[PDB]
Amino acid sequence: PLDGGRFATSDLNDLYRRVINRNNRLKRLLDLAAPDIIVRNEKRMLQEAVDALLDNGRRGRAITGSNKRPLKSLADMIKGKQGRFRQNLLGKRVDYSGRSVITVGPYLRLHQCGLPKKMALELFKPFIYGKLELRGLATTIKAAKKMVEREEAVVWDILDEVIREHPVLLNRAPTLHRLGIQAFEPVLIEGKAIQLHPLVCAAYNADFDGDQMAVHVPLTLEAQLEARALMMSTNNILSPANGEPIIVPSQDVVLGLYYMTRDCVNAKGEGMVLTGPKEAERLYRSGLASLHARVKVRITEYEKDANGELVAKTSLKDTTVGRAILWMIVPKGLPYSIVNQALGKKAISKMLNTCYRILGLKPTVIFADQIMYTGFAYAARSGASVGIDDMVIPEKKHEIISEAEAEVAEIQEQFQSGLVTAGERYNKVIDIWAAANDRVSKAMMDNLQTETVIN
Amino acid sequence: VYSYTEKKRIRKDFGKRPQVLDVPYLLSIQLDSFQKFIEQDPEGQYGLEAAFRSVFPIQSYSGNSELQYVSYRLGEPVFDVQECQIRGVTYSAPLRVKLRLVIYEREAPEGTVKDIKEQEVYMGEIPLMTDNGTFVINGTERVIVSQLHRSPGVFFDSDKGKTHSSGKVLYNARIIPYRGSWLDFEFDPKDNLFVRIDRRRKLPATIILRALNYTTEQILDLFFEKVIFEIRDNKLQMELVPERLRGETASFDIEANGKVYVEKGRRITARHIRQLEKDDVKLIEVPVEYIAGKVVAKDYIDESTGELICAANMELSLDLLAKLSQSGHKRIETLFTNDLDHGPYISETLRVDPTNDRLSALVEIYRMMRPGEPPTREAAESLFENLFFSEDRYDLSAVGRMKFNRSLLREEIEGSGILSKDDIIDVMKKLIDIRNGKGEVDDIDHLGNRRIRSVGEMAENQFRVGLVRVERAVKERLSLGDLDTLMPQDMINAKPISAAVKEFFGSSQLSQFMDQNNPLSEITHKRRISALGPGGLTRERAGFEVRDVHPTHYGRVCPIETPEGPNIGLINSLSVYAQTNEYGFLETPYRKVTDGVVTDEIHYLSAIEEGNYVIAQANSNLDEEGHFVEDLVTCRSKGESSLFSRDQVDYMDVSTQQVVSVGASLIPFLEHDDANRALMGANMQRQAVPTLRADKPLVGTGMERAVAVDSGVTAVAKRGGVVQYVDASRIVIKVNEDEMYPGEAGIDIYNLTKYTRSNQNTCINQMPCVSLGEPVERGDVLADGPSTDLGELALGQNMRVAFMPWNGYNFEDSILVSERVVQEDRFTTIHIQELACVSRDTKLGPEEITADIPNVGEAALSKLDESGIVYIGAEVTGGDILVGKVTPKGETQLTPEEKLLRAIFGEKASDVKDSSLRVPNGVSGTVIDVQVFTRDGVEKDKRALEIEEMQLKQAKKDLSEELQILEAGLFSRIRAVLVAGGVEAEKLDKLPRDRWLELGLTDEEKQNQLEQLAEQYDELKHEFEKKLEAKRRKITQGDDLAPGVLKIVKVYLAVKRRIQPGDKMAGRHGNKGVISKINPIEDMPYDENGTPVDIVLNPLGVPSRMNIGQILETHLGMAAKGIGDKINAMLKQQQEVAKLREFIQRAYDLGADVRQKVDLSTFSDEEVMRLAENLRKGMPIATPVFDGAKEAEIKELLKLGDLPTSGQIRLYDGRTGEQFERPVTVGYMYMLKLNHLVDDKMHARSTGSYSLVTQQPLGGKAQFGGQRFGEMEVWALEAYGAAYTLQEMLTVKSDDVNGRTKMYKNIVDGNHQMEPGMPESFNVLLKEIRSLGINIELEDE
Amino acid sequence: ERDGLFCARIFGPVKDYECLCGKYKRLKHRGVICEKCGVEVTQTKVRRERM
Amino acid sequence: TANFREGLNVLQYFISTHGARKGLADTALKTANSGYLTRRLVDVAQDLVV
Amino acid sequence: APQQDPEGNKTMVRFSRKTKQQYVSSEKDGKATGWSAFYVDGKWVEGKK
DNA sequence: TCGGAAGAGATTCAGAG
RNA sequence: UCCGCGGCGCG
DNA sequence: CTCTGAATCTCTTCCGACGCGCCGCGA
Ligand SMILES: [Mg+2]
Ligand SMILES: [Zn+2]
């Protein structure tokens, strides 16, 4: 039915009606002894009508309706991307699902996503009915419904009770590779944005400029056991495309670590000796030494011995205050040399990989979380920022460009004297411009990259 | 000098380049084309008159009677625009046409008339464009996008062998009419020439050539060049042009002047050609092999027998040569085949043709075009003739004629719209020349080749369709019956015309729904250009080459503004200065160069002419004499940039900004940032939402004034004067004495659109921005609109921004916001939603609006009146009833045992059920307006009668207040005329105003003026009473509504929405960001003076996106407010105004060689104080797009502001109280809210409705459906071993009509069992496959 | 309509155990055919099935 | 010749836009082909299980 | 039932064999105007055929 | 009531008889 | 409680 | 000089991401 009492007829009904009409017409022309050519015309029309019914548009001009569109025959209900096979048999719409705009949450552990309270209430409303009747607070489904729609805070207590171990699935369209769907143990936040852990967000190929994400809740207990054992993000550390880890930091985390490990030739408190990394942290936080200052520190490390024991060693090493601070979080078993250099993205990647090979899964997970926290905090304290004076323009550039244009004029006038073909003139001009551009780039990099300071 | 109004907030320009041409009226194309469509025209060139004359008159032969057209006129639109928008009726006016019917006598001459009848036909209703350039269709605003399509004419095109792939090149030339069939001509890998009609088939070209009245020998004589040979006994002569020798190899000795000389086996070169030319050779003697291998040009006859031995296109058979030579026909004619210059292609076509004669080709063409029917000579002839040469079935419009001739280099510019024989043969010759290589194919993507078709052309096309349908109806009526006893009023049926025009305006792909987020968005949508639509192009078939930029886009189409995604390239925006040539080609202004001095005259060019000349780059520096400083001035010409001397330059760009549209032009510092990010920012700027309170942007572009005034939202001073009165909603202005027309009241009034639903649910509000007694000037802005302040565009807001990573809350473009922003309602926005309630006369009893609702608490009903309508002003929340409506449920018979079961249960199982309208879930707000519309003959309830009473009272008070104001103006004019002389001011003062108007102070023209205004007063009171009577009948009259509905009620709900984490905000340079945290104001970083930062952005995005310009913007912001802060303090200390005056003069002088040059010495001190009051909040800075502020000027401005010269400052972290070691960039930035609020997207469904056929859950937020587990996600699950969750996803959660019930039961019971049945969609598939006639069934049950 | 594209006598009742003629209204006669018409006292699900 | 810090003239900017719209159209088209290819590969290899 | 159509043509009573109900229709020159109105339970409702 | 690739059918050319 | 078609819009 | 097979040419058919959001319209 439609507004105003009208009805939308499915095109199949119209095709059926046309075929019925033609059949009735042919039978009437037969039973009243029509002439030959008339019944031949009627039966040819009937055959054409059957062709339209099954596969309209398969031959000749397609049938069309008042909208001047071709009617969808039975065959069109199975062919094509709108067909029954692709649309419904695969790719079903599903109950117990929601969608929301995502958002960074840095305070989350690795395996827990921040889920808005309203969505949680809506999704788990059946479970809430169940537990509310089970605990005897509500007697009938009507009572449960009216209670939950009034949000009597006891419903909020029940809701906090239900989800405590109940993993949910997060999905980002398009699900390019299987990492696109992952399992998380929810945490309840007021607001309306789903909060992710940035590390896995890097794996999602997602960003935060307004990307939406969909959440599904498993129903059965076998299903949630599967979600926990297989899909939980604490398991998907290694990509399937290659052995290297997928959980790798980027942006502020890497910037913070890089700043934390970079040393300078002269800084506050250079050359002093620290009896332990804790004292390095103290001297930094008390403000008597800057992170970049180089210092000797007593440090203990461990190695997996031939038997499998973490045999200890302790020694004095030259390092930086920042490097000692970072080392303090490193779990037992990794060698100190891993830290004692300017840490880039690739260095952190290989550090995570070597952690995962040397030690088990869980120390690597804890190491990842600690890395994320410390990197963010020290990046914030760093206060790195970009200013217009930073993009220094190498003053050589004007000279180099004048040289290049002089050569361009020279080759152009050489062509003006007819000494060369135009194509080779073009080639020469292109070559000299490329050479000049490379020279300018080298000058810019040389001027920017290094600077002089007093010792 | 500045107008007095503009003295408020004189924005500081920085542009160095002067401006020689003001930006044109931005909407001009739409308004002027529609005017051209509707306005009267005696010449019948365009619009209604042209359309009518293109069909009329109409003549009947057996009827011996004629229908002919006198004139057309457009009636009055019965409803005003706001009434149309309120009541939902299309804004239209009646089309009236004067028509005459003629009958002649039944004797020669047929022209002897005997009777004439004339009357006016109401042949249709037509929409009118509103003053803002938008149409009003039903209840909606709609604006027609001007299309850009391939021009009619002829084009020449080649593919780089892609089709055949052997490496050759193939050519085709195509002719496109304005309407009618399309012909194209094509070569072949076998070099045959083929012709095709509407791309039907592929046929040799000779078919048409003989279909045209030409025989084979005529064809050869026309297309090819002929050579003559003579035979005498067995000696052979040929007649030669020496140049004809060029190209061949002299394998045999060749004779001239009686001497024979050839280097055998060698190619004839220019020395040989010159030798023969100086020899002046005419006829030479050649061997038999030379004439061998030559084609027979024509038939040859032997008179000794009356026999023919030579045919057309035949090779030279030596036997035939001997026979004809002995017969006596010693002369022979042959063609010439230069392997490069004179390809034998036509001859090969003549060989391969199946046809033999004109009628054979005609019937073959007919059977090609009309398969499945027996050919007939008349049928084929009629088909061909009417197809190409019936000026009504086919027509190259005049633009088609111009392009056709100009591509064929013919002198003529005009001609008949139908083709001809010479046209076809000429285009074929041109294609042959192209195949020879003495030419070049055409470039269709070139902008001198595509054409802009505006609304007028589409409107007249649809109206012509209506006219031809009506013409067929009229000729049918003429044929069927008599001619005397009827009037053409019945003969013409308006239905086809109205059907066609309404179908165009409602349905058509180019009649797209308008967007109204902000005035800029409305402007850019009106101006937008689309390549799609009727006769256009499809997103699937659009290759890269049409999308890509073409070098003649410069100055005509903005390259930046294109939308992103699959539509890219196919949608564009007019550049700011571009205007349409009468032929629809784009046109750009330029400045004439005259011997090194720019004349400053303006000339308009199209892509062809621009390509022909040399035009200088805009940024070229000049002296005051007009001579360029540099001799080697850089310029562009013929699609390439280079350097040229001062004298070679022909034209100069008008202004720097002429390459970009308005949308890009608004962005400051555009010259400093990448194109991708600039594009994204330009597009995003359209989506901005108007805030609760407008704010100026500090770093603007000057364009804001023009855009704000040109859009329709702001009320502009149409007549200068002094503002007499202002309130929240009305403006009354006294027109000055000189400006007012004689007999006018001298007072004008404006009424502001106080609150209404925008087309995207945003608010639309107009706020006055003047005060009593302030002078106002022609073109001043009296009332601001949405996102407008003092007549400047005010999309965004000014925020204090620090660039610094902060604890990951700004990770990956995330934005962190200080709570102070929320507390000040800086980004709070007002939204309006409209809800409709429909009461129907349904079967099983009618459905009525009422407050008598079953099974509901009375407290909710108390919010409603006794009629069942909420009182305006009541707050309402999700799930509550706004209006009560009730549906009968039919009989609902209960057996007596069920009757007693119901009785013990209660009042349940009622035959009457609630249907009342309910608040959408999660929405809450306040109820601002209620509307009712009801069918005639039904009683008006309490709510209906009360609102009708209030509305009629409103109309009465409005009309009476208009009367009072205008009569006060009239009597003020009485005073002004009477004081002029012969005064009796006190003697009149004792008398009441009626005496003043009645009495005569003199006997002269003054008394004539008094009598004139008294008659004016009588006329205005009579028109006022007539207007109020019409208004009252118009209010009291019922409405048509729709079938089946008795009465509709609409209620208006308004909601205030607030910035919240998950909301998306973005800055003009295109750096989107989701707000991810609000912060207690204490925690935000704060500078040395203790004022906190407001918004913290991640810096890491800047180098990788290359949005360097935005950083510069930030710096300028820190400078701008700097001055503001200082001047604010300088005001707060309440010092002498002269000191701040000199300071302001310094601040304006600060620029170097800036065009501004404003001086305060002419300003009186109260004006200076007003200026300071507006400048207290910062000094707005104007930076043109490509002549913007330089870094040196920025530094100087900062230095005058006492801020750090680098723009970086020290900063303290509030959360610990320590100091960041690095300096940080803190400044001011302009930010927008992007209308993607989180509460519009968050959605969740536990369970709900289910679809009918597939039994799957519904889709979409509105239906409260669930998300779609697409096939990619299914593959993702398959990649894991997670079988069980997949099975649960498919069977139980989605499609099992019983399994999900079992699951719901077990979950409620607390048992997480599962039972997978069968997906019902599988049974659906089985039934459809079986219905197809294919047996499919399960096995092993 | 009888014998039409939606003829209830063929495809079964539009409503659960509701005879087109109104002869029977409840499950007490579940699985019987009305005499005035060939519709069957059954569930609406049969409408989905029968061809 | 001018870098991003100094202003680009209108000519440099205009010629630069070519690459920008080329890249945007490039990615717009590439997405469809990539998705289609993935659908194919999945269909061919979906039977294989250890 | 509505006695005249929107054009003011006069109306005649007809049986809809496809739906077994009376309806009203209008004619001009004896041909059907292509307008009809039907009874939908106490509310005559009208439109194109 | 639009270009590209693959497959099938038809037509043409070369080799063999 | 609903089959869409067209259109913009964001991923 | 003719017949058959193979090769080439012509014509027809298939394909050319996943996901959400609003608006209009619907003989
Ligand atoms: Mg994204
Ligand atoms: Zn029955």
Ligands: magnesium ion, zinc ion
What is the number of E strands of chain E?
4
Structural class of chain A: alpha/beta
The neighbouring-strand order within the major sheet of chain A is 4-3-7-1-6
Supply the number of helical segments of chain E.
0
Protein name (chain E): DNA topoisomerase 1
Organism (chain E): Escherichia coli (strain K12)
Subunit structure (chain E): Monomer.
Family (chain E): Belongs to the type IA topoisomerase family.
Describe the structure.
- The structure is cut from a larger assembly and holds 3 copies of chain A, 1 copy of chain B (1341 residues) and 1 copy of chain E (49 residues).
- Chain A is built from 15 helices and 10 strands.
- In chain A, the strands form 3 sheets. In chain A, strands 4-3-7-1-6 form a 5-stranded mixed beta sheet. Chain A has a 3-stranded mixed beta sheet with strand order 8-9-10.
- Chain A is of the alpha/beta class and 455 residues long.
- Chain A is flat and about 115 Å long.
- With 1341 residues, chain B is α+β, with helices and mostly antiparallel strands.
- Helix content of chain B is 31%, strand content 22%.
- Chain B has 39 helices and 66 strands.
- In chain B, the strands form 19 sheets. In chain B, strands 30, 31, 32, 33, 34, 35 and 36 form a 7-stranded mixed beta sheet that branches. A 6-stranded mixed barrel of chain B has the order 49-62-50-61-60-65. In chain B, strands 26-8-27-29-28 form a 5-stranded mixed beta sheet.
- In chain B, strand 34 and strand 35 form a beta hairpin.
- In chain B, helix 15 packs antiparallel against helix 17 and helix 32 runs parallel beside helix 35.
- The radius of gyration of chain B is 41 Å and the shape is globular.
- Chain B starts with 11 loop residues before the first strand and ends in a 10-residue tail after the last helix.
- The relative contact order of chain B is 0.08.
- Chain E has 49 residues and is mainly β.
- Chain E is built from no helices and 4 strands.
- Chain E has a 4-stranded antiparallel beta sheet, with no helix packed on it.
- The radius of gyration of chain E is 10 Å and the shape is globular.
- Chains in contact: A-B, A-D, B-C, B-D, B-E.
- Chains A and B meet through helix 3, strand 1, helix 4, strand 7 and helix 8 of A and strand 61, helix 32, strand 66, helix 36 and helix 37 of B.
- Strand 1 of chain A pairs antiparallel with strand 66 of chain B.
- The complex binds magnesium ion and zinc ion.
- Magnesium ion binds at residues 207, 209, 211 of chain A.
- Chain B binds 3 DNA and RNA strands through helix 36.
- The PDB classes it as transcription.
- Keywords: RNA polymerase, topoisomerase, DNA topology, transcription.
- The entry is titled "RNAP-TopoI complex on bubble scaffold - consensus reconstruction".
- Chains A, C, D: DNA-directed RNA polymerase subunit beta'.
- The organism of A, C, D is Escherichia coli.
